[PDB]
């Protein structure tokens, strides 16, 4: 299938409680493979997946150096952001950044990302062209004019087209046993009455990888979109994910309901009923 590499940075100021915390995680698809935390005893870019551990001293030294540099830069950005928004120095604020690349089945760059936020709101985003910027407000427009003057987009694109794609491809090869393996959902339907008149049918998907999945209920073959309770996909802790979808049905009409499961691990979609 296709694949993505993403890094996620989180910087949070905490006045009176020392300098901003900087935490960084790296993912390939839905598999975390590195982390960095400035609040750790000995902050270093550290492995969180078996296939990354083979990388040598120079690797970890490099990545760590990047994380420390970025840490300092985003501490200054927090200061900068206070001035742009006319905010006081007593409040706690957060800068978030996500970036990375998507490749196709053949390892070709499908598209690149570089998005930043301030206090949970969009701040500035590299456009899909990797040459221009979308700024969310007049403060971000200030950053934009700085980044235009400095050919920042130019640098990003050279990364997203070069090192990002190359390293992702290397990771996909080093971790092929897992990163290139989809585990299909294990599926079943449960039934619990609410009253004389109504019963809950709940369609389960367990143990699947990657997280992307579609669970839908049809009644008489018609999607029950506005009528289905759909819980957030949740990690199991063993690499896999879980989800369910529930519908409230009239007692005696359970066989008019079917559950439909779409997932990459499944050759074709599955249809389930209550047994």
């Amino acid at each position: 299938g296709s694949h993505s590499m993403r890094y996620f940075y989180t910087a949070m100021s905490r006045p009176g409680r020392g300098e901003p915390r900087f935490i960084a995680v790296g993912y390939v698809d839905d598999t975390q493979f590195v982390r960095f935390d400035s609040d750790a005893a000995s902050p270093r870019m550290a492995p969180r997946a078996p296939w990354i551990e083979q990388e040598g001293p120079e690797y970890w030294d490099g990545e760590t150096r990047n994380m420390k540099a970025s840490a300092q830069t985003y501490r200054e950005n927090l200061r900068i952001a206070l001035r742009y928004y006319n905010q006081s120095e007593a409040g706690s604020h957060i800068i978030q950044v996500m970036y990375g690349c998507d490749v196709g089945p053949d390892g070709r760059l499908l598209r690149g990302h570089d998005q930043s936020a301030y206090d949970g709101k969009d701040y500035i985003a590299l456009n899909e062209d990797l040459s221009s910027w979308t700024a969310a407000d007049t403060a971000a427009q200030i950053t934009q004019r700085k980044w235009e003057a400095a050919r920042v987009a130019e640098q990003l694109r050279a990364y997203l087209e070069g090192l990002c794609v190359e390293w992702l491809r290397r990771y996909l090869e080093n971790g092929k046993e897992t990163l290139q393996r989809a585990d299909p959902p294990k599926t079943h339907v449960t039934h619990h009455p609410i009253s004389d008149h109504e019963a809950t049918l709940r369609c389960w998907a367990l143990g699947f990888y990657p997280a992307e999945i579609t669970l839908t209920w049809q009644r008489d073959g018609e999607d029950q979109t506005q009528d289905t309770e759909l819980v957030e996909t949740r990690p199991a802790g063993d690499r896999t994910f879980q989800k369910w979808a529930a519908v409230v049905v009239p007692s005696g009409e359970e066989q008019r309901y079917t559950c439909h499961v779409q997932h990459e691990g499944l050759p074709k979609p599955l249809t389930l009923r209550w047994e």
Partner: peptide, 10 residues
Amino acid sequence: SSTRGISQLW
């Protein structure tokens, strides 16, 4: 290098 050895002031 896998992260970007880039990082920019706002």
